[PDB]
Symmetry: D2
Subunit: 401 residues, 4 copies
Amino acid sequence: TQLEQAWELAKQRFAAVGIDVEEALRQLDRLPVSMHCWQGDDVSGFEYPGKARNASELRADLEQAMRLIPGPKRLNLHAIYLESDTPVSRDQIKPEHFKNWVEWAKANQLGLDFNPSCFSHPLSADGFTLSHADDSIRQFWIDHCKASRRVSAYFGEQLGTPSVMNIWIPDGMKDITVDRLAPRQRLLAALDEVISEKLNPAHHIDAVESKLFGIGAESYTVGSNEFYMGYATSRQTALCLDAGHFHPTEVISDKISAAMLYVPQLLLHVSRPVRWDSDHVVLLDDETQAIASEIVRHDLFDRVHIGLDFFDASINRIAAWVIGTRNMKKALLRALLEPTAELRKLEAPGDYTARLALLEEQKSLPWQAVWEMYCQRHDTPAGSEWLESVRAYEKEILSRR
Amino acid sequence: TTQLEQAWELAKQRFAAVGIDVEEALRQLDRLPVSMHCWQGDDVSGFEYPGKARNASELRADLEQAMRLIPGPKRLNLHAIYLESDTPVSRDQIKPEHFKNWVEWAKANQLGLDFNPSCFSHPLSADGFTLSHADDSIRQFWIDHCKASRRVSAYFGEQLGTPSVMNIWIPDGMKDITVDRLAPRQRLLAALDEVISEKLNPAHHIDAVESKLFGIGAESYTVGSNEFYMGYATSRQTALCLDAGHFHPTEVISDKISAAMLYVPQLLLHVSRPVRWDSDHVVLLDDETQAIASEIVRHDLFDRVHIGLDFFDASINRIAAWVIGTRNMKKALLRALLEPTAELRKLEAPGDYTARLALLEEQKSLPWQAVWEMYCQRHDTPAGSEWLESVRAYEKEILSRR
Amino acid sequence: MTTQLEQAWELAKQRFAAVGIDVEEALRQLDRLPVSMHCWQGDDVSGFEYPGKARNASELRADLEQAMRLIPGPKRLNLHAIYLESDTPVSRDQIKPEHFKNWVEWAKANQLGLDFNPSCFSHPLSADGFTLSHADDSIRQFWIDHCKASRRVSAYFGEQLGTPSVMNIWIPDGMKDITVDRLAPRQRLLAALDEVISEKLNPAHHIDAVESKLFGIGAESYTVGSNEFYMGYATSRQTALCLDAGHFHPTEVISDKISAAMLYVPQLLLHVSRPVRWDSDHVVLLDDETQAIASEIVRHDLFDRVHIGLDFFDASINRIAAWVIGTRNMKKALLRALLEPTAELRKLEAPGDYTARLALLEEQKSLPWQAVWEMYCQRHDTPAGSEWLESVRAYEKEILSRR
Amino acid sequence: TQLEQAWELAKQRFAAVGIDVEEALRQLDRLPVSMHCWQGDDVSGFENYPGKARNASELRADLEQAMRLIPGPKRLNLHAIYLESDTPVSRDQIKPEHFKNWVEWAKANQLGLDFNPSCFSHPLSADGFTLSHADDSIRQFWIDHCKASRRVSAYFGEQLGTPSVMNIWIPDGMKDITVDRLAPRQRLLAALDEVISEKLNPAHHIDAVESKLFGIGAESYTVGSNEFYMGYATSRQTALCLDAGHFHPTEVISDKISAAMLYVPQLLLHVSRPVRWDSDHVVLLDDETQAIASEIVRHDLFDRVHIGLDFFDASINRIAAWVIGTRNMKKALLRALLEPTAELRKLEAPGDYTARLALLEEQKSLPWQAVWEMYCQRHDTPAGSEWLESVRAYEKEILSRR
Ligand SMILES: [Zn+2]
Ligand SMILES: [Zn+2]
Ligand SMILES: [Zn+2]
Ligand SMILES: [Zn+2]
């Protein structure tokens, strides 16, 4: 009844500022968050203690996390997560190698997203993949990405929802670079080849993702913010914006509204960068809230794909997924509880005083009560009690790995 | 019960469940005053968006309007240019008597007062140097102004029963590539020693020094830098002023608090929101404001910290700016007072970083709002946005005629 | 020509020849890279609607000629619409080529190309901090009109001078504080620019460019015309893209963006300036990023698709000096890039010989380029060194002083 | 040769600005650069790029090839893990004997040695805390290791007749949101006081403390912050280590030199090039390297500054890395020595900011290169890029057999 009592007070409070809490919960059910598989086994693939060591364990881990996160979710898979009794050369992956993932997804009412894996491989050892000067190596990655599109399309055909396939490459140089041009020219041509095969948009979407820098490649990144904004606008692919991939102080929240005027869809990777593209777990913080607000304010339900893109191996992995996913949903909920029309109007009239005042007052409205009921409705713990389940799971299962 | 009472009860139970006493949190919140900056009221004009105050009366009226909408203890932070004299007073000769009206009004309004010498917007500050000026007479004038200022400050402490913290900030610096960064710093070091040489009663006055990374037109070099003043406060044992808008991009004063406190006796924390630069925007209930509050409370700094606003936004209603900033700082302090610190510290000490991260994040969805609203109600101030209405009324009635 | 200069020059010639660099070719290539000097630095951006600033067209031209005789090689003048000359006030939206005739004439007599810019600031109708993106249709149309009119002046310049005029579009639009709707103003801006560029003009006479800004004082939380907004704009509409060196995030550098943008937009306008803690608009120095920008232009053989312009404003020192220092530094950075054995460095890089690449790049810094710069100055009847400052001081004494 | 012709021309150009090229060379010889031993073996110690050194002989051999290609005075900065023992030695039990071969070689090569306790890559540093570890036993182990290291350092000074600057750097910090930043800082401060409690001869040994903003896997909080160590160095009077790669984006140590020097007795400058992080890339002849050099020379810091390299690049030839970095620091120093500082200073003092800027910029095209090349010739070292050929040949002959 505590939870129910708080919910009822909240419902009246929000009603007073024109916000319907029941409607906000329904809208929250329209915003899946795509969970990254790679957090479960430290990006190992199948080619703090307790990491998953195979597909079965990764799925068991995912299910434990899923039970503690309310509402819709998707699973974002990397190519290295294929399941084949025999080894498969990247450039020859096929839908059958992801059949188990597909059946599981169906059983769990999940959509699946995908990504070619252009890293941790003999052919990525020089720090170039798709922009590699060597024609054969370059062809090898082009072929891997072409094959991955087909896997992506298969996901969409089987599951009823298009699979967003994100393209990210580590390509770049550690130190002062003489020719930033040639590798970009090669990248441009290669991607063109990559997306040449027309696939059903109902099942598949191509996205491109930039990075400012990587360890061991901090002086130059072939696929920069500008290179990709140019690519996405000119070839009409989705553009992926990564909250941890930009300059210090640089925010993707601002970029949403500018990019949407030129690209058909956006993929938002949320993560927390700390002193660098550190990939820390998403918190309910200023920038995560700004991203959620931009999504909801512009009614981006059908053109935005929300995903987690962090990696922390210093804490329980299941907890990392839980904490991050719940935070992203809490930020979306708060955005949905905003009296946007009222604020836009005040802003349109130059009432900047009221605008700031009311934005700040929203922070002390009882949104927590609404979140707790959302959890209850999805039979998920409303508060810290979820950690107990993770603890129990660690004791029974993970401790034995 | 009223709805406020019902929500409060709920919250009370919810927090008692994590070992937090909501009534006590409210009591502790009263030990943390926030010093309002007088200069936001008249665009730093002094008395030497429409509606700015034009004289002391107006400024005091405006302050009263903001204070009745801000719950709990407050202080007023005054600048030397806010003296009230019938005749002009050279800066180097101000006296306590030039701040009598301020003192009488602070007494009547249950406010402590803080002070600052005004080392800018003056013929003698035109070269961009004051206390570090190469010219002896110019340098002496600022030294003298600062010394006189300390006596005004001690006077406030003597009269109001709480020490006045007198912050020293100068604009000194160079816009472009500088050849000699040393000599201005040597002169600065010597000047301040001179400035703080008259020993005053610590029960009435405290000296503080404040760095700044850069300022428009003094962008390549600042005489009084962070290192300069951390060395100064540590070696001279003055208070150190940390300003949330005065550092490098990504740089945070919350981290600095526990480090500096091991070397300096007291800390003056200036909150403001830097936006793309040392812009001085109104303080929001955001990550860093919360971080600041959390360090204060976590390290039990009640008796060694002095909290004040330091921003200036003349694009919105001035009274609203003070109300928003002050209430935001109090909200952050209250959330820190509601943290189950002991438990978190224990998990952290055990290396349970999973539970520490989880529990920090779960604290964000605990019902601190009901506690805040009760705090406002008990202090006879609006719990929500209704305060805006008071401001608007005041604007129609009084501000619109300025 | 003194014997010392000639001697230093011949030693440098050999030295460079030894790394496969022809110094004479470098100077010829330097003559193909004009630098567009910004007119606004001469009068503090006052327009015609530290002491000694110019107060009108005549004074501005005289000040520019003093700067010009101290800067070697090709130059252009970048004019703002507020620099128009007419006996009586002209509404911004009604400006005409005739209002710029004396500029055109002066440019012909001085062998200068001319560049242009609509002026969307310092005006009653920009007071709200919105111009091309203003929600008010009338205000919006005023600025669109001002922009379409400006294109005509630009085209005229190009028709008259025989070199296309690059016309850069920059607006201050944004919000100081937390913003609710960043989309609407961007939608309006997109539409407004489409209207602005609707009239087709002769590309041999005119080029359109768009310039982003990260943040303006008073407009710090949101900038309508952001980097992404214009990158999408220029790619999609095929206008030139303007990259401003003071305009971005901390540690963010236009040198890296050059090669990315050029794959998508037809031309690039590079505005060089030095940000100091902010878009402070300080004078260009021969420093790491000015050199990085020069190297990118030269390495990629961008002679014909790049337009190099200064864009800073420093009112604390002598103005003529500011233009001289800035322009001379841009040219020196260009010359150093031209003296680089790029093909050899490129080949080492291609081989993964990063050791040799770093080493040689660093050794170039201690090669005698100074002698090459001094010869370029001498051939162009400009001071080789510090002596130009005397010229400046003399002019101050004689002219600026009396202002 | 052309070298000398070029030199003569330069001698004249610089004599015209009041600068004596011969005096510049003599002064350069008064500025040693402390090369970091760890660049040669990837910080492995003896407890992409091929050819790394694998033991003391190899590293010494490698250091020798580098030294022949770098003109002028140099020193070697050693880490405790570079001890030479036939058997394992617990870090807390190192002795002078364990570094005797280093001492002897140093004597022979006319080198001064600097030192550092190694509080990383060890089972007892695995939790990310060392001197600030809450476990008393772990903390003691590190305190003991640092105490023993001081004795090693004093030994070097005693043997070589030049003080060994022993730099204290710890990785201590937390990767994520931290609850208590105070407690580890209190432990660190006490720990350091113990560490430096044995008095040693200042002519043989100097203690230095080094801050860090963040470390990979310790990004949220660093126990030994800039303010922490500025307070420590000022209050305990140790040297302060300023690292060019350890601060916030856009933050520069060049500015800090003149501020810190008013409070601490000596400064250790660690030059390196951060790229997006403390990437420890090779020092370039660039803006900040030049700015640091300029501050040292401008303030005549010969005796109170210790210049060292602190970068680590494993992607290119290691010898080349040392050569480029050391030559680069030296070139920056030379340029600073060729600056007409007095004139500049006098312009600035007069407010002639036009001439100051103008002249600062014209120095960049003055023929300093001919002066650098002659410095190289005078020290029997390659003046230009030929040195690479020497490294190439050593790689061929030597670094290939590894
Ligand atoms: Zn991502
Ligand atoms: Zn302050
Ligand atoms: Zn520009
Ligand atoms: Zn260091």
